[PDB]
Design an enzyme around this catalytic site. Structure first.
Site, PDB file in Angstrom:
ATOM      1  N   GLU A 105       0.825  -1.207   0.000  1.00 27.33           N
ATOM      2  CA  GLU A 105       0.000   0.000   0.000  1.00 27.33           C
ATOM      3  C   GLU A 105       0.870   1.274   0.000  1.00 27.33           C
ATOM      4  OE1 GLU A 105      -3.127  -0.069  -0.729  1.00 27.33           O
ATOM      5  OE2 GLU A 105      -3.656  -2.127  -0.190  1.00 27.33           O
ATOM      6  N   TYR A 112       1.221   6.714  -6.955  1.00 30.41           N
ATOM      7  CA  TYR A 112       0.248   7.753  -7.236  1.00 30.41           C
ATOM      8  C   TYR A 112       0.826   9.153  -7.023  1.00 30.41           C
ATOM      9  CZ  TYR A 112      -3.388   4.206  -7.602  1.00 30.41           C
ATOM     10  OH  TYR A 112      -4.177   3.144  -8.011  1.00 30.41           O
ATOM     11  N   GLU A 202      -4.801  -4.968  -5.865  1.00 32.77           N
ATOM     12  CA  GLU A 202      -6.063  -4.735  -5.161  1.00 32.77           C
ATOM     13  C   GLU A 202      -7.056  -5.878  -5.337  1.00 32.77           C
ATOM     14  OE1 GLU A 202      -6.598  -2.207  -2.888  1.00 32.77           O
ATOM     15  OE2 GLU A 202      -4.441  -2.168  -3.142  1.00 32.77           O
TER      16      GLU A 202
END
Ligand code: NA
Ligand code: NA
Lengths: 286, 286
Positions: A105, A112, A202
């Site tokens: 994560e 991102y 995910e």
């Protein structure tokens, strides 16, 4: 009872001893995660700026916002893993999986944030996007929903594991599809490749949630689950049609709504329940 | 005071938001950790058995007990990271490092357990070794010492970070040197290669502990640190000379005692203090 009659949650004096493996299904999912390890540095972003500059302003707006949403949501998933899931589950094989998910994560969040930094040079705009939970109304409903499940002192692990499968599986699905749409348009290789890695990860995190769910002795009822999943779908549909319309990148809002319901149905089946919406997947590219 | 004046420990509303990076030194250590990722599957153990079988019985005894000590201690380090360090430290950069350290400890622990499984076929002997904290007197002093620091509700982060640097840097040092000795003898390339990877990781984990310590406003006193470190040294020396003598693999117990003191001095200097023992490194291979 309440938790002593749950193998996943009951006292394990061997929790920090790794061998021998007793839950081979859970372990194999950890092995799968470990085997698909990647870092943000591996993604080639060198072709993206030209494509980004060719976009219409509204497309750049939509993309920067989906990125800000993903980066922020990861932090909520991460918080829940660090404070709740990795602590309460007592089986070693699952602790290993969750430990690795936390690490992945942070890498997702970095990817991102690096995409934001590559595309957006203005420091005020970067800061705005990094602080999306506080600065961006479109993100609020989903962020609040996920965070309530972290603060919920009543909800059982069974209910909370479903809620986070909905976060990683329903709340992300529309945004994942959006970027795959950009791929179909031949736009921004770095974004679309990283999106392949991340949605794969995910998907694995949701599969893991379903596996944990199946290992529970006292599951919430189909009714309770339907309720959680339907709520999530409505929030996601609102996000993609009202708050940050997929129109902005040329997508059909109506078909997008149908895609979210297809996704939810598949999650429901994977959780061992019945479909709820009974619609088709409208997107050939997903 | 007492915690709200510590930048590492005080409230950070941005703790789960990754960017922008503000502690570049802490962040670079995480990036270094991330760049040195490896899995047990990358270590070839196939060429070890012949060497293993050619050792004296008490060399096999020594090695298996070192392996079992390492695997057990990994779980205590891991427990501390999961329950304490990763929770209490509020800066994102360190949280990322600790998240990645948890994952790597799980990989170390798997590696040690695979080394055991490869060398030792007998399922009773495996189970004896996997349960070393309960079954093996030689690990009791170190295990108890490390575990006390997890359960200590009054000791500061500053004292506990030192204690765990002593665990990863002093409690491991003699065993790492033992395995490096086996390399010098040209024995068991799989074992000695995994040892290089793991000692390097543990070295980084100790460097990170020192970096965190430097970032504290209220540090424990030099005298207090000295006391912790000296105690750790004595326990490690006992382990290597009495409880599991390095004589069993042809090493000199006096030179080993001296190596531990040298390691401790290097840590003391890294923490920002003075040498304690003022001895040379007796080992050219370290
Ligand atoms: Na275990
Ligand atoms: Na932060």
């Amino acid at each position: 009872m309440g938790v002593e009659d749950e193998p996943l949650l009951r006292e394990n004096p061997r929790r920090f001893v790794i061998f021998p493996i007793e839950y081979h299904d859970i372990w194999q999912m950890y092995k799968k995660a470990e085997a698909s390890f990647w870092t943000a540095e591996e993604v080639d972003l060198s072709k993206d700026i030209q494509h980004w500059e060719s976009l219409k302003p509204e497309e750049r707006y939509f993309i920067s916002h989906v990125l800000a949403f993903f980066a922020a949501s990861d932090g909520i998933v991460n918080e829940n893993l660090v404070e709740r899931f990795s602590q309460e589950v007592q089986i070693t094989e699952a602790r290993c999986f969750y430990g690795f998910q936390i690490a992945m994560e942070n890498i997702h969040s970095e990817m991102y944030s690096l995409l934001i930094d590559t595309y957006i040079k203005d420091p005020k705009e970067r800061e705005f996007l990094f602080n999306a939970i506080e600065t961006m109304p479109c993100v609020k409903k989903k962020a609040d929903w996920a965070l309530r499940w972290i603060g919920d002192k009543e909800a059982t692990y069974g209910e909370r594991v479903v809620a986070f499968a909905a976060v990683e599986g329903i709340f992300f699905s529309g945004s994942f599809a959006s970027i795959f749409w950009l791929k179909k348009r031949g736009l921004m290789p770095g974004l679309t490749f990283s999106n392949e890695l991340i949605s794969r990860d995910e998907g694995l995190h949701c599969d893991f949630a379903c596996l944990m769910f199946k290992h529970l002795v006292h599951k919430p009822s189909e009714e309770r689950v339907r309720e959680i999943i339907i709520n999530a779908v409505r929030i996601e549909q609102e996000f993609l049609t009202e708050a940050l319309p997929v129109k902005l990148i040329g997508m059909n809002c109506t078909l997008m709504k149908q895609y979210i319901e297809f996704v939810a149905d598949r999650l429901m089946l994977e959780l061992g329940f019945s479909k709820v919406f009974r619609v088709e997947n409208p997107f050939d590219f997903m």
